[PDB]
Design a protein around this ligand. Structure first.
Ligand code: T3
Length: 246
């Protein structure tokens, strides 16, 4: 590999990696709300709506499905299934917001300047921000605008998600080595898929910087959550939302 890159060849996926790629892609497509017809099926949140009580209410009433779809995505990855229960929980809690944010970001529309949540609710920066996210909204929107020129396909989005999922640095993990090895497997297949796609200069390095940003979005959301349960009541939070962000 290192030798091949030296010569200047950009290795494309092996047959082994194409299998992994098909698996991850299908896992994402099956659990991606509203499939590919999301634009027609989206409804714009009334300009008047939107910590703003009602805005927060709308978002939190649909976060349960969004969350379980992330779990559904992970369940369809055999590597994820090989991990012990404790690690599975830790990986899910860790990447949940990161992946949900990605899925919202990739559905940014310059025309309306909105993101689409769960493929059905189109919101502006101001609305998402006032409904509880604060600056996390700015971060997700900036990412979305930024990603439009990356022209990511379902496979690329799927692989980003898999890389986020398999983070061996989540506190409390037991299977550090194994999870890192899983991630390396995804990263390699990812880079090979990107060579095959032939996008844009320094594409791969630029994409990896997005991984870091999604990381940040997850972390700031944790802080936002602490700010929220100081304001909003506790009864305003759905049970699964509480389980994941504790
Ligand atoms: N759109 C995604 C899922 C998704 C659903 C929702 I509601 C989102 O807004 C949030 C998220 C966390 C919060 O604490 C609050 I308040 C609002 C986002 I960002 C993403 C998908 O397609 O799976």
């Amino acid at each position: 590999e290192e030798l091949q890159k030296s010569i200047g060849h950009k290795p494309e996926p092996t047959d082994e990696e194409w299998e992994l790629i098909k698996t991850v892609t299908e896992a994402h497509v099956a659990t991606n709300a509203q499939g590919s017809h999301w634009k027609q099926k989206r409804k714009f949140l009334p300009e008047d709506i939107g910590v703003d009580l009602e805005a927060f209410s709308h978002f939190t009433k649909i976060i349960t499905p969004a969350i379980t779809r992330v779990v559904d995505f992970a369940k369809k990855l055999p590597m994820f299934c090989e991990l012990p229960c404790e690690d599975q929980i830790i990986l899910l809690k860790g990447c949940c917001m990161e992946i949900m944010s990605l899925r919202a970001a990739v559905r940014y529309d310059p025309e309306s300047e909105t993101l689409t949540l769960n493929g059905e609710m189109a919101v502006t920066r101001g609305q998402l921000k006032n409904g509880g996210l604060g600056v996390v909204s700015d971060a997700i929107f900036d990412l979305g605008m930024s990603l439009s020129s990356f022209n990511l396909d379902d496979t690329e989005v799927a692989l980003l998600q898999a890389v986020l999922l398999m983070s061996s640095d989540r506190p409390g993990l037991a299977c550090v080595e194994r999870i890192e090895k899983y991630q390396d497997s995804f990263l390699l297949a990812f880079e090979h898929y990107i060579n095959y796609r032939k996008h844009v200069t320094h594409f791969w390095p630029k994409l990896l910087m997005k991984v870091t940003d999604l990381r940040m979005i997850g972390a700031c959301h944790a802080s936002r959550f602490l700010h929220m349960k100081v304001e909003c009541p506790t009864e305003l939070f759905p049970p699964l939302f509480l389980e994941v962000f504790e």
